[PDB]
Ligand binder design. Sequence first.
Ligand SMILES: Nc1ncnc2c1ncn2[C@@H]1O[C@H](COP(=O)(O)OP(=O)(O)O)[C@@H](O)[C@H]1O
Ligand SMILES: O=S(=O)(O)CCN1CCN(CCS(=O)(=O)O)CC1
Ligand SMILES: [Mg+2]
Length: 322
Amino acid sequence: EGAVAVCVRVRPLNSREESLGETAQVYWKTDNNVIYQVDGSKSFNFDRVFHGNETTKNVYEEIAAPIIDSAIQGYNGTIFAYGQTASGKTYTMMGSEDHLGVIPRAIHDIFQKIKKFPDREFLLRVSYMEIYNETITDLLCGTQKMKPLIIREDVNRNVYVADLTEEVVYTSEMALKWITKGEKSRHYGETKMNQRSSRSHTIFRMILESREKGSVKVSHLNLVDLAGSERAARLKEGCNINRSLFILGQVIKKLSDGQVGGFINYRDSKLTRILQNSLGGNAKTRIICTITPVSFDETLTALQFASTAKYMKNTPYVNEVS
Ligand SMILES: Nc1ncnc2c1ncn2[C@@H]1O[C@H](COP(=O)(O)OP(=O)(O)O)[C@@H](O)[C@H]1O
Ligand SMILES: O=S(=O)(O)CCN1CCN(CCS(=O)(=O)O)CC1
Ligand SMILES: [Mg+2]
């Protein structure tokens, strides 16, 4: 099966002598596929832990590529980047020209792999949205900022954002051109109140469709870069909670504990309503939890959340429509 898999990626150290003069502290270490704390008794087991030396390419090839292949076969696939601000989420998901992230790699990979299937026909379209302060803005637009999450897909009642721009692309060059714009149009935002980046979620989605030479395979591939988890989580004001991150973890815990039907509060947040099907539904989900050794509380929180997600159960299948 392996419908749900979790891994951890550790941000490399720019040192071992540095900041707090002659040193800050390293609270975590990873050996084989376990991550334990320096001087403490907490340890965590994951079926894969990438160390500071391993490259985004390797993370992509081991984790993401199988999801892409599955997407091409008609399976819904979702991938999240979760972790503290500055732990490597965007580096892993978007990256640079020197070190392409998972999103651009997936695009290049998809266009190269559909060619290995001449008998069938391919239809691809992309979307790019941002979720901030409960409000959903379209990143390939002209100005209706806030859209609603409707349900009218009476074919299992699938969720969707009230007609958000969906652009048809034939080349990876065009796909990436939309990303670039979306990235840019992220700052005609910024000074509504900034570093809004570390406080918002972004979802890049690609809908794939295919047929031979009567039934059409249809799959949704969501690629998620979440908000900083330092604001994820009994308490008074001693931090600053992000509603979505909190509801995300709350929904994950319940699923891992055995709850279903309606004991799962997907509706208490936009994030969890939108990505509802990815949390215990009809998709292959993977979570990449980025961590930084020099952090203790934040790393601990993310590890607990990553650990809990290992036990989530999804039931994926091919989606062919008559
Ligand atoms: N695995 C890595 N290898 C080299 N540099 C990294 C790695 N992960 C993160 N960085 C660098 O660390 C800094 C933190 O980046 P970032 O991805 O923006 O954090 P986050 O998106 O989670 O808030 C960036 O300058 C980034 O290029
Ligand atoms: O700031 S964050 O966007 O991260 C999360 C806050 N936001 C509050 C409003 N709800 C949805 C209500 S409903 O639309 O389902 O009625 C989603 C989450
Ligand atoms: Mg970021």
